[PDB]
């Protein structure tokens, strides 16, 4: 909403005089904004026709203001009646059956979700962590000890396997968040970080580690590129040869991600994940 | 027990009329069955003389019925008196010192174990997750942020190192669970999934990722195979060369597991893990 | 303090008659010692001029005595009012705002820290695990599902990325703990274990797995070594070629860590992590 956006933009440029004691329109707009984020009714980044993802910067600014509005406090519920110390509440703070019923996702103990992360109906949260401003769309599977970092956009039917980490991107304002598009399968122990994008229907194997510094290599040609996995890619862990050692015909090889197949919606629908990864 | 098995088989074929309101013999048999699973008095898969693992399908059917019998509910105990939302209780629900004394394992906060997973005496659960129907045998070490997936069979004295994930296998009925046999050491960040089997006394290094699609390669010959690590194997992360790039003598290499040594009970008893992995 | 050290040394050699019922000077000295560890006023290992790390063995002995002094007990606070079963209390046991205020670190639910681990001001604990006797120095970032193992020494401004595990070293007495020196960046999914040392200002990429058995390889020469990353190293995941298969010119390659750059304080200050890892 246009009024909220206006209040947040002005407030953020005046943020040095926003603090735990602030009330009025600024506290209300920031509060409302994070509520809208929590319900997925607005999102940090959205895909345009043009097929690219655009940042809604005012939403990152709302999140940043909430740090100023909200105090560090003792947060009960640790082992032996002990406590934590932080300034971000659980998404599930005060939730009863009414709220869980309405949201329609599964939240397995002891998963952690911070307020302002949207979890869509039919998502399954195994013990895992979903950070501020994230958007986890319908039917997503967030497996054990996975992580959905700040502002991260996780598509419909995405499977984040055990120990998969999707890196957070809050600051800078302009910086696009990490994006896993609709219907990707991401194998166990993989990491995608730093505003990298995995396009729709891709299949990553285990131990695929993509950040802004990772060579993503075309199997056919050796073409090296960064930051983006094309649609319907099959990507596995591998290496590229390095310089040979003085006077010898061999050297160490270095990690890269390897695109082993550039497939198809049709093919993805006709071919199992394991078939894709095997032959 | 034979009566329980009979009640469960009939109930499972009639499962569409089993729900949270079901009581009588069906609720009792399912309940008893999961209790027997929780105590390790029965198990999802067992090793036969013949040396292979056989699925007790009725036990998978009991677990699947329990989803129908048990409601989604608000589960207290999250941060700031917040709650979770799921239909599987903690193994430790209502446990006092009597139950922990009898079971004889160590449960470090904030590990999570779902009811129907057997944890044997002298096991150590660091913060970790053990899923339904798992069987964790005597003296097993389940290190921090490890995962023991549904129905997984973990042998005596097995060491699952930090961040090691053992994949769950519930459906299909016939599908064998992931099996780590007696006295295996599994190095940090490794994953074994999808009904793959690591045979007795094997030593896996760090980042060894075995699923049904992973090439497990014999170091001596290049022989490629799938799904099973032989007894007393020493297995490390590696690669195999791919196709060379157009007109060149080189190409990218792809991840595989590499069997670097096919050893011995004697040798495993005489040789340290690090010695095995080093030379 | 010299008196404490004396009481602990004598007690440890008499440890077979120390138990949950022990009181007097032995209970008090062990208690005080772990309190000093918890506050970082003493540490398990310290860097000498001479530039090497020396073990304070009496502190490892205090920790080991505390196992004898402290009983297994039911520890409340699990899901659905369920409990854990262990003999080590949370660092945060009984902590109010006074204690968190004084310590000055951030403790995000649901991180776990055992009593006797020092967390310095301005550290940030995401959901993670810090074990006994660890020393986490000022401004350290402990990301989600990271692990700081027993006695581990983590330097000032160190960034342990998602899923990074730093291995614990309690016994043997003489064994030096795992050490990450000041200003290291450790990329996601990496593991450093077993008393290995990463020297000051080093940058490890994702999936760098260093233990006592891991070949750490010099990119320029192929020089293979173990246990120590030199200062201002840039280290990435890679491989070294193995024996070729019978009669062929090729074979499988095996995992190693690769030092790709031996840099500089100046260079580290002038060059971003991603620049260092990229070119």
Swiss-Prot record, chains A, B, C:
PROSITE patterns the UniProt entry points to: HEXAPEP_TRANSFERASES
GO biological process terms held by the UniProt record: diaminopimelate biosynthetic process; lysine biosynthetic process via diaminopimelate
InterPro entries per the UniProt record, alphabetical: DapD_Trfase_Hexpep_rpt_fam, Hexapep, Hexapep_transf_CS, THP_succinylTrfase_dom1, THP_succinylTrfase_N_sf, Trans_hexapeptide_repeat, Trimer_LpxA-like_sf
EC number: 2.3.1.117
Pathway: Amino-acid biosynthesis; L-lysine biosynthesis via DAP pathway; LL-2,6-diaminopimelate from (S)-tetrahydrodipicolinate (succinylase route): step 1/3
Keyword set includes Acyltransferase: yes
Compartments it resides in: Cytoplasm
GO CC terms: cytoplasm
An MF annotation (GO) of this entry: 2,3,4,5-tetrahydropyridine-2,6-dicarboxylate N-succinyltransferase activity
Broad EC category: transferase
Catalytic reaction annotation: (S)-2,3,4,5-tetrahydrodipicolinate + succinyl-CoA + H2O = (S)-2-succinylamino-6-oxoheptanedioate + CoA
Record: residues binding substrate: 106, 143
NCBIfam families: dapD, PRK11830.1
Cross-referenced PANTHER family: 2,3,4,5-TETRAHYDROPYRIDINE-2,6-DICARBOXYLATE N-ACETYLTRANSFERASE, ACETYLTRANSFERASE
The protein's name in its UniProt record: 2,3,4,5-tetrahydropyridine-2,6-dicarboxylate N-succinyltransferase
Organism: Brucella suis biovar 1 (strain 1330)
């Amino acid at each position: 909403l246009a009024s909220l956006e206006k209040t947040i933009e002005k407030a953020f440029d005046e943020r040095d005089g926003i603090n735990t004691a602030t009330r009025g329109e600024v506290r209300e707009a920031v509060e409302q904004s994070l509520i809208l984020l929590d319900r997925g009714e607005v999102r940090v980044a959205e895909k345009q026709a043009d097929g690219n993802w655009h940042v809604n910067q005012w939403l990152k600014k709302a999140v940043l203001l909430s740090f100023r509005l909200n105090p560090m406090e003792v947060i009960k519920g640790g082992p032996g009646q002990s406590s934590w110390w932080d300034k971000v509440p659980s998404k599930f703070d005060g939730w009863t059956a009414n709220e869980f019923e309405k949201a329609g996702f599964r939240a397995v103990p002891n998963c952690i979700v911070r307020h302002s992360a949207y979890i869509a109906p039919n998502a399954i949260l195994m013990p895992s962590f979903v950070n501020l401003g994230a958007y986890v769309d319908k039917g997503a599977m967030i497996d054990t000890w996975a992580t959905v970092g700040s502002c991260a956009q996780i598509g419909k039917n995405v499977h984040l396997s055990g120990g998969v980490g999707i890196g957070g991107v809050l600051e800078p304002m302009q910086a696009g968040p990490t994006i896993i598009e609709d219907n990707c399968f991401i194998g166990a122990r993989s990491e995608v970080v730093e505003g990298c994008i995995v396009r729709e229907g891709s299949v990553l194997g285990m131990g695929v580690f993509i950040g802004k510094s990772t060579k993503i290599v075309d199997r056919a040609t050796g073409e090296v590129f960064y930051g983006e996995v094309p649609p319907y890619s099959v990507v596995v862990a591998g290496t590229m040869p390095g310089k040979n050692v003085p006077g010898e015909n061999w050297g160490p090889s270095l990690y890269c991600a390897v695109i082993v197949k550039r497939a198809d919606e049709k093919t993805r629908s006709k071919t199992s994940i394991n078939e894709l990864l095997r032959d």
